[PDB]
Structures are given as structure tokens and as C-alpha cells.
A paper describes a structure:
Boron, essential for plant growth, necessitates precise regulation due to its potential toxicity. This regulation is achieved by borate transporters (BORs), which are homologous to the SLC4 family. The Arabidopsis thaliana Bor1 (AtBor1) transporter from clade I undergoes slow regulation through degradation and translational suppression, but its potential for fast regulation via direct activity modulation was unclear. Our findings show that AtBor1 is regulated by two distinct mechanisms: an autoinhibitory domain at the carboxyl terminus obstructs the substrate pathway via conserved salt bridges, and phosphorylation of Thr410 allows interaction with a positively charged pocket at the cytosolic face, essential for borate transport.
Full-length AtBor1 was overexpressed in Saccharomyces cerevisiae, purified in phosphatidylcholine lipid nanodiscs, and the structure determined at 2.3 Å using cryo-EM. Particle expansion, 3D classification, and local refinement of one protomer improved the resolution to 2.15 Å, allowing the unambiguous building of an atomic model with robust side chain densities, doughnut-shaped aromatic rings, and water molecules in the cryo-EM density map. Our 2.15 Å structure of the wild-type transporter is solved in the inward-autoinhibited (IAI) conformation and reveals previously unknown detail, including C-terminal (Ct) domain swapping within the AtBor1 dimer. Importantly, we were able to resolve the Ct domain and construct the model up to residue 645. This revealed that the Ct domain comprises two α helices (H11 and H12) connected by a loop, followed by a rigid hairpin that deeply inserts into the cytosolic cavity of the neighboring protomer in a domain-swapped manner to block the permeation pathway like a “plug”. Therefore, we define our full-length AtBor1 structure as the IAI conformation. Specifically, Arg637, Glu641, Arg643 and His644 on the Ct hairpin form salt bridges with Glu502 on TM12, Arg153 on TM5, Glu604 on LH10-H11 and Glu323 on H5, respectively. Interestingly, Arg639 on the Ct hairpin does not form direct polar interactions with surrounding residues, but its guanidinium group forms a polar interaction with a nearby water molecule, which, in turn, forms a polar interaction with Arg153 on TM5.
Numbering used by the authors:
A (entry chain B): 624 to 645
B (entry chain A): 5 to 276, 281 to 373, 457 to 630
The structure:
């Protein structure tokens, strides 16, 4: 299963670190 | 807006968790070093790049020594007595631009010259500190909820444009003779200059492409988990090291300065407070320093607050309170100190602060953040120690740093909804179903395309006007005012032209996303109602 940083990599924008709401 | 009320509440809240803020960091053991090293590398490389930019722009008065020293001292002080330790401080590009404007102004006036630039900058910093004190005391941080997306993303794209412009300027300059160098060296013959320029292109593009690729390592299917995480976390410094090593390959057969390496001097070499020179500045210019001081104060009031907000997103499930007012007050004090010491001021930086919070997070299978002061203190101390290691850092070719500038510009884009809307504006009308076939912003489905187009055209015109303003020799220092005016514009003018829910969708506080739709569902939509069928060669 994916690690914490692997998961957080997908839900946070790279430009500004904003959480994505889907 | 009761004076001192916000500061008092912040201090009362943060004084109840100080000792825990330290012991929790101590209780983490040696595992606190991984986030510390990650954030240290995220902080150091851009600050060195900005130091080189200043070295070029101030004729050597300010270099990477000063930017690193400012970052380190401000970070250490903020870690010890700051309100929100998750916030990372550093010298940023808007500060570099403002200082470049100030140096250009000072160099052209006989009364100031290059010998009083740092004294006049000290006065500018004094004015800025006073303005930030007033803003913090009067509770101006209560209205930071009005710093909406329209301003933040426009500012981000403007900084991205400036980054790319700097990369281009540096790469162009690699082909020329530097201003303050012995022009008779073999390094500067036309043949060797052409060779240096082409080698710089190779190195910068290698750095950029490899660094961009490394960012997605955690989603690869090769290697081990720890190796993938290592690449994803330290790709940038690793690629900087790799391309430095590459640059040393032809060292045996080329002149000394091929390729060109960092221009910042070594502080250890015998050749090497501005208060004494501050009293030598004429009174007229002491008063006139109020003009750039207000713009710098506006910049810091915006950026510090936004960085802290990003670091404190509610999805992090943080348990300790915020300190916006007190942190603005401390930033004022730090700006005063930096001005008195002859270094540019530091402020909260993006995306370093949210990335710090993320690096401190774990999922309890549900985000839990280890909030303490040790990580910030240690990373600031390491940034300070980079000053002693300047001889090692002087081995980095400048082209690698120009590539890093391009990297920062391109990395400004991925989560920027303004950039997404520009790309959508350039999309062929019959190919928008392709936009609906992947993850996309919700306004793409909930807002008519005409409204999106008008909103984007207005924003793009504003951005281009600001970028052009930065090119005007003297008035360019007013661009933070252009940024600030977007707040009242959004609050009062936009509602007249745009309708309610559409403005809310296009300027949402949270990042709203929708999953990919099936083709049969991407065709019923208004935006995807003009689906042209593919050709034979497309099949």
C-alpha cells in the first residue's frame, strides 16, 4: 500500500501545497 | 479592530504550548532529521540562486553570503520566538526585485551612489518595520480572508514570469563578457565564450529536465520504496550535484573559467552594521525611503499571511492556534534587524511552508502533524552553516542555477487554476471533451464557457499590465500596489459584471476538483457538446 508521502503527493498541489477536494 | 487585541490573543494562545512545542520535537529522536534535511534543501537552493541574482544586479554589493545569512538568522529567531513554527522564512524573489529597483535608483543619484545603497536600504527597512508594526497593532490581519484566489494565482504567475525571464537573461549572459572581470583572460576569447555559452545551455537544460522528471518518482514502478522516496525528496540537490560533476569532466583540457561558476565571494578570504553610514544619508532621501517601504510592507503583509495560511490548512488537523498578528509584529522586528545588519529581509515563503507541514505529517489509518520548533531551528542553522561552506558551493556552475530558475517557473504551474484557464482558453472548441476526460476543475462543468473566457481575459490583461510595469525604470517599484488593488476590485467591481455563483466557482477558497467523465457523459455537457469525430489517421 502507498505510504503517507505518496498519498499526500497526490492530494496536494505542487505549486502552492493546496489540498485537492474531489 | 481593537489595538493590540489580536497580538494579545495570539501570545496568550502560543504561550500555553511553548514547552510542549520543544519537548515534542525532542521526543521525536533522530527521525526529526529527515524532514529537517528535506526542508533545508528546499530552502537553501533558491536562496543561493537569489544571491547570485543580486550579485549580478547590485554590482557585487549583495551576494549569496547575505541572502543565506538573512535566511538563517531570521529562521532561527522565528523558530525560537515565532508564533507559528511551521512557517518557513527566507529571502524571496519579490524582495530581490524591489532591491534591484532600489539599487538602480541609488546608483543614478550623485548624493547616494553605490557607497550609500545599503544605508538607504537600512532606512527603507526602518520604514517597513514601522509600517508592519502599525498593521499588526491595528489588526489588519483580521481581513486576510479577502486575499482570494484571483490575487494569489496572479501573483504566482507574475513571479513565474520573472523566474523564466531571469533564467533567459542568465543564459544569454553566459555568451558575453561579465561586467567586472579581467577582459584579457583566455576565458573571454570569442571561441571560449561561445563554448561556455553552449556548455551552459547543455547544463541548464539537463538540470531542468532531470529535476522535473525526478518529482514524480514516488509513482514509479521501479526500485524500492525508500529509493523512490529519496529521489522524490532530494532530486533537485542530487541533480545539482550530478550536473556539477558533469561540468567538471572537461576541466583538464579547458581554461580555468570554463564553465563559469558562482560569482559570490568566499567570506573566509581576507579580501572579504551599516548604522554609521546611515547617519550620512541626506534627510530628503531618508524621508523618500518611505515610498519603496510602503510597497515592501504591502508585499510582506500579503506573502507572510498567505504562506502561514497555506501552512495551516484545516486538512492538517492542527491542534495549536494561529498567530497571524504576532507573527506580523515579529516580521516587522526582523525587517528592522535585517536592514540594520545590511542584508535583505526574509519573509514566509511558498511552497516551502506547506511542504514543511506535509513533511511533518503521518496518516493514522486521518492526517496528524508533528508540530514542534526543532525542525525549523535545525534547518535554519544548516542554512547558516552553508555560509561556512561557501568554497564548496562556489563549485556550482551558474548555468545550473539558471536552469533552477526555469525549474521554479515551471513548478509554479501545476496547481494554478489561472494557468489551467489560460490553457483552456487556447483549447480548440471541438476538443474540450478532452479536457472533460481527465481530472479538471469543477467550474469547467458548473460555469458557462463564455463567462470563463471573460474572467480569464480580464485576469490575463491585468497580469500582462503588471509584468510590463515591472519593466518601467522607476515606476516599476509600484507593482505590489497593482497586486493590492485586486482585493477591492474583486470585492466591488467584479460582482457588477459577473453573477454570484459564477464568481464563487471561479474564485473558490478551496481547490475543487472533479473526476474524469466517460465520453458518453462528456458529450452531453454544454462545454463538450461540439465533439468532432476523429479522423482515419487519428484511429
Amino acid at each position: 500500500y502507498p505510504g503517507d508521502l505518496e498519498i499526500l503527493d497526490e492530494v496536494m498541489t505542487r505549486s502552492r501545497g493546496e489540498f485537492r477536494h474531489t
